[PDB]
Design a protein around this ligand. Structure first.
Ligand SMILES: [Ca+2]
Ligand SMILES: [Ca+2]
Ligand SMILES: [Ca+2]
Lengths: 124, 400
């Protein structure tokens, strides 16, 4: 499974920790770093955001709602290009934002875990 | 010459006759004079026309291009003339992305460079690993060229295209916990891997470009070290780390995806050099002249990354690039880098690795696997490469 421990931020953000990731609290959410000492660990952050996303981003279906997102790519190293996803979904009159990074030499990563994390998150 | 006379006497010939002629060209002490005689008599074009199939033609062409100097361009012209009714030439099998004249020119430039840089001469012979599965089963271990690997199954190609996790995993880096991978190996096991890696002949796509048998990887690494003010121990450490995190399957994917309809931007070969990065930084600069380089297709570049000498030189040139770049940075702007590697000495990078703090090796390792000097670090690659380095520092390890 993808997730274990339920985490709750004072700002009302609630989400489960990705299994095998170290969790720490950030300003408006949580940061997750893949555990151990890996070559190319996935890094994720999920936060409450009150301002709307920037306009005109690509959209996708997420659960019963939508999400707006953008992926960026840059030269990395022997483990491949660096990739970073930024995505936002509405939560009432506010938003929940996930950002995630990992390298890939095989094109854009699915970011399946980041999308699952964004879908799993809610505001209380 | 004796050789031109012998060749004219034998003038498709049989495989035996062809191997005889090629052997004669390769044993010739006066290659230029021989070519001049054959060019004058008009027999050179005939030689090029009568030596097939492509396997034999490649051996002949590589030998002639490599050994000629004063008569190289006349030889090239004779070859061109012989290709008028033979559009295919040497463009088959592993060499399908090299136009025949590009093959000639690559062999010429490579022979010249091996001479000039000091990696022409053979002397090691073996021995390669027989592994075909698991960590350290890529070309570094086995000497099996990625271009020689069987086509990936069609269905696997489709699942890879659609990013199917199980299939992607099968064809990707085999290691997760790097520390655990190393802790299961005895110091002797580690030395054995390093010696296997550097002691065996290069897996080269252009063997007849060399005056004799192909050189050891160690010889090529020493040459690259001299050229870029590195050490073969450092180049060796970077490559051994890559090759531990490599399988035969990954080699197959790396190359085949790069030359597929997708023109994938994979990391390929010994040092796991990324295709677009080899292009952007002209990483073959010291082995191939500008005309050849400006002519190379992307897929020709990927293919070259599968040839060990090109890959070793590209790897070393890139390491020197990363070090030079570091030497230009302001450590105050890299606080995470300083936190992880508190003894890092950025200026020291401009000079030879013998004088780098070990923290420099660790940091550069991070910035070889990932984007360099962005203050985002690989948590595990530095210790992994550093362990390989320590192995190469063993007194049992000797380079040319
Ligand atoms: Ca690899
Ligand atoms: Ca690769
Ligand atoms: Ca980096």
């Amino acid at each position: 499974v993808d997730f274990d421990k339920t985490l709750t931020h004072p700002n009302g953000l609630v989400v489960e920790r990705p299994v095998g990731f170290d969790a720490r609290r950030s300003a408006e959410g949580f940061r997750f770093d893949e555990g151990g000492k890996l070559r190319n660990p996935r890094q994720l952050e999920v936060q409450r955001q009150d301002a709307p996303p920037p306009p005109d981003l690509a959209s996708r279906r997420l659960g019963d709602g939508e999400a707006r997102y953008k992926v960026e790519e840059d030269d990395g190293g022997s483990a491949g290009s660096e990739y970073r996803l930024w995505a936002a979904k509405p939560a009432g009159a506010r938003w929940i934002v996930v950002s995630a990074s990992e390298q890939s030499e095989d094109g854009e990563p699915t970011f399946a875990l980041a999308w699952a994390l964004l879908e799993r998150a809610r505001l209380q | 010459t004796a050789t031109s006379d012998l060749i004219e006497s034998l003038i498709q010939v049989t495989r035996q006759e062809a191997r005889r002629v090629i052997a004669a060209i390769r044993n010739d002490n006066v290659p230029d004079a021989t070519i001049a005689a054959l060019d004058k008599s008009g027999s050179l074009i005939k030689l090029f026309q009568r030596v097939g199939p492509p396997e034999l033609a490649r051996s002949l062409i590589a030998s002639i291009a490599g050994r000629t100097t004063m008569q190289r361009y006349q030889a090239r012209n004779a070859l061109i003339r012989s290709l008028i009714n033979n559009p295919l030439g040497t463009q088959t099998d592993n060499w399908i992305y090299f136009p025949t004249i590009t093959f000639f020119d690559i062999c010429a430039d490579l022979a010249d460079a091996a001479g000039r840089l000091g990696f022409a001469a053979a002397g090691a012979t073996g021995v390669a690993s027989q592994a075909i599965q698991g960590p350290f089963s890529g070309v570094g271990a086995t000497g099996v060229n990625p271009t020689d690997l069987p086509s990936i199954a069609f269905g696997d190609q489709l699942k890879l295209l659609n990013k199917d996790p199980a299939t992607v995993t099968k064809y990707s880096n085999p290691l997760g916990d790097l520390g655990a991978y190393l802790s299961q190996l005895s110091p002797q096991d580690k030395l054995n891997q390093a010696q296997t890696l550097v002691g065996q002949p290069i897996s080269t796509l252009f063997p007849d470009a060399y005056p004799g048998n192909p050189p050891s990887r160690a010889k090529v690494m020493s040459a690259a070290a001299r050229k870029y003010d590195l050490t073969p121990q450092l180049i060796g450490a970077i490559i051994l780390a890559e090759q531990r995190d490599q399988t035969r399957d990954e080699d197959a994917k790396d190359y085949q995806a790069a030359v597929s309809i997708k023109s994938a931007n994979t990391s390929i070969g010994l040092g796991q050099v990324v295709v677009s990065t080899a292009i952007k930084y002209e990483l073959f600069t010291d082995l191939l002249g500008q005309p050849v380089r400006r002519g190379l297709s992307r897929k020709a570049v990927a293919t070259l990354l599968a040839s060990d000498e090109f890959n070793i030189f590209a790897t070393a040139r890139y390491i020197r690039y990363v070090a030079n770049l570091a030497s230009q940075q302001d450590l105050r702007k890299l606080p995470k880098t300083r936190g992880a590697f508190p003894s890092i000495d950025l200026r020291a990078y401009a000079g030879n690795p013998r004088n780098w703090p070990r923290d420099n090796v660790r940091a550069l390792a991070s910035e070889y696997t990932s984007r360099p000097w962005d203050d985002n670090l690989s948590p595990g690659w530095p210790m992994f490469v550093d362990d390989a380095y320590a192995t190469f520092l063993d007194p049992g390890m000797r380079f040319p």
